[PDB]
Design a protein around this nucleic acid. Structure first.
Ligand SMILES: [Mg+2]
Ligand SMILES: [Mg+2]
Ligand SMILES: [Mg+2]
Ligand SMILES: [Mg+2]
Ligand SMILES: [Mg+2]
Ligand SMILES: [Mg+2]
Ligand SMILES: [Mg+2]
Ligand SMILES: [Mg+2]
Ligand SMILES: [Mg+2]
Ligand SMILES: [Mg+2]
Ligand SMILES: [Mg+2]
Ligand SMILES: [Mg+2]
Ligand SMILES: [Mg+2]
Ligand SMILES: [Mg+2]
Ligand SMILES: [Mg+2]
Ligand SMILES: [Mg+2]
Ligand SMILES: [Mg+2]
Ligand SMILES: [Mg+2]
Ligand SMILES: [Mg+2]
Ligand SMILES: [Mg+2]
Ligand SMILES: [Mg+2]
Ligand SMILES: [Mg+2]
Ligand SMILES: [Mg+2]
Ligand SMILES: [Mg+2]
Ligand SMILES: [Mg+2]
Ligand SMILES: [Mg+2]
Lengths: 187, 258, 144, 123
RNA sequence: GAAUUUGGACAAACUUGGUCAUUUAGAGGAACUAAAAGUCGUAACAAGGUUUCCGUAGGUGAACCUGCGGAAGGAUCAUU
RNA sequence: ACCCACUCGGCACCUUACGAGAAAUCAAAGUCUUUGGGUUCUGGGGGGAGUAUGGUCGCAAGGCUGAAACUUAAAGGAAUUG
RNA sequence: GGACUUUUACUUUGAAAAAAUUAGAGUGUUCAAAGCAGGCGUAUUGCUCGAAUAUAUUAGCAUGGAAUAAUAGAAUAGGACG
RNA sequence: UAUCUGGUUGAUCCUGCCAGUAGUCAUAUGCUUGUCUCAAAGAUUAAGCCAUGCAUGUCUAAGUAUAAGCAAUUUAUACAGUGAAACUGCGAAUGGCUCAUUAAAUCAGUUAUCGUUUAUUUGAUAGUUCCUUUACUACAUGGUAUAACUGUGGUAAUUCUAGAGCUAAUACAUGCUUAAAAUCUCGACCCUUUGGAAGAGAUGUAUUUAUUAGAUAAAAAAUCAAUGUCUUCGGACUCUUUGAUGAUUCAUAAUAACUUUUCGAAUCGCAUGGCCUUGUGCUGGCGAUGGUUCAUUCAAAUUUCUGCCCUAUCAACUUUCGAUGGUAGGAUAGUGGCCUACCAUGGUUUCAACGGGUAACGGGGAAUAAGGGUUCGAUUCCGGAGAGGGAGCCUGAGAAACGGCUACCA
């Protein structure tokens, strides 16, 4: 099948090699997952020395992490909006590592209300003292704040769906978000 | 290729087993164990050729299945079980205990030891790391893992092993002046009173080694086994005491007694 | 040199697992990670205060220097972050009791922490396979 | 399979087959010492060459060289034990030119004739 | 959960053209060979009876012949 | 412009061999079994044969490059006596 | 641990260059090719020496020398000590 | 063991070459042949094709036996003696054979994995899991099928199998039971403002993601932000805690989560002992097998530097569609143009690229050698490749396996 050897294509001098040591198993390869959205269907694939791998297809949700507050939530994945490797991945909504995606962002909104409770966009005594102690944290960043009102946050898939079977990422923030924003608006 | 090999041809075994090149196509392949393949006694060689207790390979097998031979306090009833440097080969019957020590020529010699001190072994620590749940441990030259060691124990040291429990009784730091043993290299089988070592950052730390007769020589760090302080050792040295007596005076010495 | 307009790639370039928290504010707005390669090799000040990424940099990257150390003469700077050095040597032919001039070209990765031009003498350090043909990384420049 | 069995040749024929100065000398050695072939003389001269080769390689080395003395003593003793070399000539310089029939006369062929009880080498 | 089936990668095998070594063809054409006695002349070896030879060109049954330029391996180390 | 002595460079000649060579001869063809100053090119029995073949240059004549199969103890460099 | 560090070729010494094979130490195959055995006692209980050593170009590593042969620096001084 | 001799002439000074001479783990052949030891042997041409018969199976005290098998019971009315068959577990990836392919390829010496997998050995190493976890519950141990077997058949034929009926597991598939202590979260309420609470949940390991610690060449002061364990709230201020490498984002630990959810023993043989509130009550040894992770060992994969025969009647090659590098991603057990998208135009070469030939597997080595060398190495050891030619793949730790399977070609 697919091989990862180098006995094929030419050496640095440009010389064509002879066919020696026909394909061995330890140097095989497999097809991509090409993971789509919705109707979770994950197949397990056996690998060298056992240690079977997860080949995710059609994944529904994923564990997304907010680095600023150090929290992670399992949220629905909306779609793919930008991909450095290939634009066709975006049109087919295929999820790979380092893919810019949109998430529903609902669990963060409830968490933010449950943790600071000030507002997004725009009772007991235990409640305010925790919120009062957790002060100077409701002014995180303007651009990400406007995304919550839309109900669609921005994230980057930091996991490998074809390898581990999980689609996990983090919410874009800081100045890397601005880099992705300008490319999206460049149309 | 295509998988691990399960045979060891003759003329391919380590030369220190002293197996005759004729009389058989194959030599005993050591099993996987606490020691490497080339640095291995294995018992069928030791119980048949060294001690002459057994003549054939079948009656080598019979001895072990009666649970007579035990290695390091464990029976280890394996025909080709790998025995390595200073593994206490003890026999409950015949009330004899053997320790594996290199002779002057680098071969394994029979070293009968008293029962009182045949209940421990020295181990050269290879690596010191942290286990799971933050539990430090050390690995000796025979693969043993000992948890919660002394913090001052570092790499290249030698540790005495209780040989009844996994805990340690004593250790020796790897410093200049300590009594050392040559395990491997060209000078294999010598005791050499370490003097100085050269750092050689990047690889292959070296060390200078001086014999009791002031005969100095150099060997890699991987081949030196510290076995105590200068003078009194922690183990009973075999005959010869690791002097590398020259061939010219070897005939003179053997001519004295004839 | 010229900092090569670091953010002209189609993807965002950053040192992995190096977080610059927007919540707090301090000097050196972007945190930079660097390491000393060892073997008596000093990390140039260009890497400490630079803005490049160079995943394969020996000072600010995920590669490590280990193995053979070689010295060579630069003959090519045309590629991007890759140079070719020339390693001249004499091969002995015992029959004629005398020698033979020979050379070997070595493709080697070069970090933006070094500015190399053709004719320089640089020493290189072995690393894991970087490309189809590159297995070395420039660690010191000893010419001009 | 098993290790090969080591075997070696123990004689060498002369380069010139028909030379009268050597042809009659060969019949001389085989004459009064009862030998059935020239290979007996050919055999003896083979390690006679080997002995000289070892001795020549020893004299090239420097004096007091441990290798010169060690195999020098072994070679000088081993021929003295056989008796082809007299005790007086123990200098490693008289072994080079010992003789061609010195080895041959030490054979059991001659000893039975030397020490009576045979009254002829052919008997 | 079998048959069956969509798309894909690996890709045997086959057809069509380009490029890589050994064998048919002698109906043929023009070189060496081997040679106890062939034929025609007599080209070279002596000033070989026109010195020889080289290059180039032309001619001729065959060696060869001629022009031009060159050489001495010539038959001249030499005409104050 | 001649004469004498000397000198630097050059075309040559005369004598001799301590030297070389296979001799003929050679102040270079010497300083080479006492075998090494630097460097370029060419040769490996005589023929087949500067032929065959493939390139390449030329308008052409041909030049440059350049084998094999096969054949076989048989012409001189040099001197000597007739 | 600290900042500097002119780079080479060359040569000494040391570690590594599997076993068998090569040279070679000792030794009963009756000699020898071989083989690594064996030898020694009151032979009733048993004791013990061996199964060496050398060679192994080139490349890599460590190390001393620094003659020989290269290499770089201070010349419209942006040179050194400070 | 640094040696030569014959052959051009009437006679000669002389690399010629021819011939002679010696050796060959260099073959073949001819003639001849008494003994002892030792021993290569369908390599060369055809990695051409093969009848036939063999060359991989395997069990203990310790996985499963109602043989409608064999003997004796009297230790047993459930079983435990032997044991065909079959299920299960390992093995069959070793060995052995050959040298076709292969010319920076293999291979040799020498490096790295801080760039990976590793069945088997060996040492360590799971108190945490009844899930709305106060009746959901068997935890003195729970569910199903099925082989072997009985019976009914199909064909000329295969180590072909169908239908009907049982029965087991270390088969398959579920599944709980063992202390605490401590820390975090939420949080009733008194209500203080200096603030404390009842109560609930989580905190093993395995996967994935994000963040944090993993420091350390020297010594003293200024106050601002609030005191910060204890206060004479003046502030004494220390104890605070950190391993390894030449080098790390290393080991390890901490937080938030995630997982279609891994492991955390429903297994087997022998001995049967102590304690009482004498109940088939509670404790209790020697083992075997299995199991997550770590280390070890047997390995594997990739990889550093240098080194290979002959040819220019091969001088330029590579990049159409990968050729060289960058970024990102997929894939792999992993690095890597290994593959994909985009980008740049690179990379090798008279120090002989690229191409072509090899009656080329490479080495350890063999023959002959004064010294330098020449020729050979299919072949007893090491590494590589192959099972008629290619390709593809299941199982398994390990095969692109061929005495394993599928397809095409012959
Ligand atoms: Mg074995
Ligand atoms: Mg005529
Ligand atoms: Mg006539
Ligand atoms: Mg004439
Ligand atoms: Mg003139
Ligand atoms: Mg010739
Ligand atoms: Mg010729
Ligand atoms: Mg003749
Ligand atoms: Mg003449
Ligand atoms: Mg050097
Ligand atoms: Mg000669
Ligand atoms: Mg003549
Ligand atoms: Mg004649
Ligand atoms: Mg000649
Ligand atoms: Mg001849
Ligand atoms: Mg095999
Ligand atoms: Mg062949
Ligand atoms: Mg274990
Ligand atoms: Mg990549
Ligand atoms: Mg790339
Ligand atoms: Mg071949
Ligand atoms: Mg082999
Ligand atoms: Mg194969
Ligand atoms: Mg066949
Ligand atoms: Mg196959
Ligand atoms: Mg077969």
């Amino acid at each position: 099948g697919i091989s990862r050897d180098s006995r094929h294509k030419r050496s640095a001098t440009g010389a064509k090699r002879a066919q020696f040591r026909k394909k061995r198993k330890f140097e095989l390869g497999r097809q991509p997952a090409n993971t789509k959205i919705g109707a979770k269907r994950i197949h397990s694939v056996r690998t060298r020395g056992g240690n079977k791998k997860y080949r995710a297809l059609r994944i529904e949700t994923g564990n997304f992490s907010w680095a600023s507050e150090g929290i992670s939530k399992k949220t629905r994945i909306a779609g793919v909006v930008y991909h450095p490797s290939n634009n066709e991945l975006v049109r087919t909504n295929t999820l790979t590592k380092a893919a810019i995606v949109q998430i529903d962002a609902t669990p963060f909104r409830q968490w933010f209300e449950a943790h600071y409770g000030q507002t997004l966009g725009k009772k007991s005594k235990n409640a305010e003292r925790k919120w009062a102690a957790r002060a100077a944290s409701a002014k995180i960043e303007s651009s990400v704040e406007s995304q919550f009102s839309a109900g669609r946050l921005y994230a980057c898939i930091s996991s490998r769906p074809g390898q581990s079977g999980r689609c996990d990422g983090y919410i874009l923030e800081g100045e890397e978000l601005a880099f992705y924003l300008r490319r999206l608006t460049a149309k | 290729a295509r998988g691990p090999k399960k045979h060891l041809k003759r003329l391919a075994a380590p030369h220190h087993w002293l197996l005759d090149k004729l009389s058989g196509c194959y030599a005993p392949r050591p099993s996987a164990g606490p020691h490497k393949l080339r640095e291995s006694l294995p018992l069928i060689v030791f119980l048949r050729n060294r001690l002459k207790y057994a003549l054939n390979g079948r009656e080598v097998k019979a001895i072990l299945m009666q649970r007579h031979v035990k290695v390091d306090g464990k029976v280890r009833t394996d025909t080709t079980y790998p025995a390595g440097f200073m593994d206490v080969i003890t026999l409950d019957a015949t009330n004899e205990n053997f320790r594996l020590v290199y002779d002057v020529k680098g071969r394994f010699a029979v070293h009968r030891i008293t029962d009182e001190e045949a209940s421990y072994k020295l181990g050269k620590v290879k690596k010191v790391q942290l286990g799971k749940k933050g539990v430090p441990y050390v690995v000796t030259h025979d693969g043993r893992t000992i948890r919660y060691p002394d913090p001052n124990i570092k790499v290249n040291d030698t540790v005495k092993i209780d040989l009844a429990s996994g805990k340690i009784t004593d250790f020796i730091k790897f410093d200049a002046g300590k009594l050392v043993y040559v395990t491997g290299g060209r000078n294999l089988g010598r005791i050499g009173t370490i003097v100085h070592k050269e750092r050689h950052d990047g690889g292959f730390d070296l060390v200078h080694i001086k014999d009791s007769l002031d005969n100095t020589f150099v060997t890699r760090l991987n081949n030196v086994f510290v076995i105590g302080e200068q003078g009194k050792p922690y183990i009973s040295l075999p005959k010869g005491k690791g002097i590398k007596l020259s061939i010219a005076e070897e005939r003179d010495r053997r001519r004295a007694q004839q | 040199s010229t900092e090569l307009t670091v953010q002209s790639e189609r993807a965002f370039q950053k040192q992995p697992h190096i977080f610059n928290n927007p919540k707090v504010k301090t000097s050196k707005r972007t945190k930079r990670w660097y390491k000393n390669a060892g073997l008596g090799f000093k990390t140039p000040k260009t890497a400490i205060e630079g803005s490049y990424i160079d995943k394969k940099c020996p000072f600010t990257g995920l590669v490590s220097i280990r193995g053979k150390i070689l010295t060579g003469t630069v003959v090519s700077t045309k590629m991007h972050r890759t140079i070719v050095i020339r390693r001249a040597y004499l091969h002995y032919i015992p029959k004629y009791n005398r020698y033979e001039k020979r050379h070997k070209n070595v493709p080697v990765h070069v970090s933006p922490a070094f500015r190399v031009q053709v004719g320089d003498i640089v020493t290189v350090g072995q690393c894991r396979p970087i490309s189809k043909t590159v297995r070395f990384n420039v660690v010191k420049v000893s010419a001009a | 399979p098993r290790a090969p069995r080591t075997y070696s040749k123990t004689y060498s024929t002369p380069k010139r087959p028909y030379e009268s100065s050597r042809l009659d000398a060969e019949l001389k050695l085989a004459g009064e010492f009862g030998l059935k072939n020239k290979k007996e003389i050919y055999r003896i001269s083979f390690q006679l060459s080997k002995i000289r080769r070892a001795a020549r390689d020893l004299l090239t080395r420097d004096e007091k060289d441990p290798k010169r003395l060690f195999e020098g003593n072994a070679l000088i003793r081993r021929l003295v034990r056989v008796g082809v070399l007299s005790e007086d000539k123990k200098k490693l310089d008289y072994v080079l030119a010992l003789k061609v029939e010195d080895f041959l006369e030490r054979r059991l062929q001659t000893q039975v004739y030397k020490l009576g009880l045979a009254k002829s080498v052919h008997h």
